Homo-oligomer: A and B are copies of this chain.
Amino acid sequence: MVHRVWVETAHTHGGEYLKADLGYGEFPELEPIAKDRLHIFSKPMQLVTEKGKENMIQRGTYNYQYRSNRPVKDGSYLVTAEYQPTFRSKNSYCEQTRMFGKNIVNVGHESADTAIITKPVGQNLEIVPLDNPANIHVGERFKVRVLFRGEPLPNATVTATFDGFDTSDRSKTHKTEAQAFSDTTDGKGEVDIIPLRQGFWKASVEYKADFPDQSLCQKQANYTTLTFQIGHSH
């Protein structure tokens, strides 16, 4: 069907390596990226810490698994993935597709720092959180912002779902695309997600616009997600 990009990190305590997974497909099913689509993920996923952006390495039984170079202390970090810009033809016209994913990882049951996670990373279409997902109970408001080319993106629809919401009769041709939240961004680009359950959540946004250089391509489509945790697994 349709393929979107997201990131998922396993529960990590202090002193360990950070195991992360790049999902290209239908959330939340992790699946290996096909050989004809290996070139669209040219660069490895990055990990954001107090020192900056670090390249992760690809190690595991499947090609979507990554681990950090060195173990990290307790804290709260981001892990980002990118679908490299590619060109396609539709009907006819050219269109450049790009996709982005960012996951908030809280290593340690006590850390909920906001210094690293709230700073934008430079994704063309980016969802920047303004709080820590661990500070939000069910029913509270999780305030985030939507940026496009650096500036805020007003009047942009942000939806959100979680693992376990849409599950009935799913297969290759059924969606499990039902969302547990939907709203629009204000003039400052901000919006508040309201989670009614606990688990692993993904908030999605998209933006189709005109390509800057019309002598090369005409349209542009960006699909961005942000993944986090509501509640506590351990």
Chain A residues near B (Cβ < 8 Å): 141, 159, 165-166, 168, 173, 175-184, 186-187, 192, 194, 196-197
Contact = CB atoms under 8 A, between A and B. Distances in A.
B180 A180 contact: yes
Given A173-B186, A175-B186, A186-B173, A168 B180 contact: no
B176 A179 contact: no
Given A194-B166, A196-B196, A182 B178 contact: yes
B178 A180 contact: no
Nearest to A141: B168
A183 B179 contact: yes
A175 to B, nearest CB: 6
Given A141-B168, A168-B141, A183 B178 contact: yes
A177 B184 contact: yes
6 contacts: A165-B194, A176-B183, A178-B182, A180-B194, A180-B196, A196-B197
Contact of A176 (B166, B177, B184): B184
A52 B175 CA distance: 37
- Please indicate which of the listed interface residues A166, A176, A180 has the most CB atoms of chain B within 10 Å of its own CB: A180
A192 B178 contact: yes
A183 B165 CA distance: 12
Nearest to A157: B182
Contacts of A187: 173
A194 B181 contact: no
Contacts of A165: 194
A173 B176 CA distance: 32
Given A141-B168, A168-B141, A194 B182 contact: no
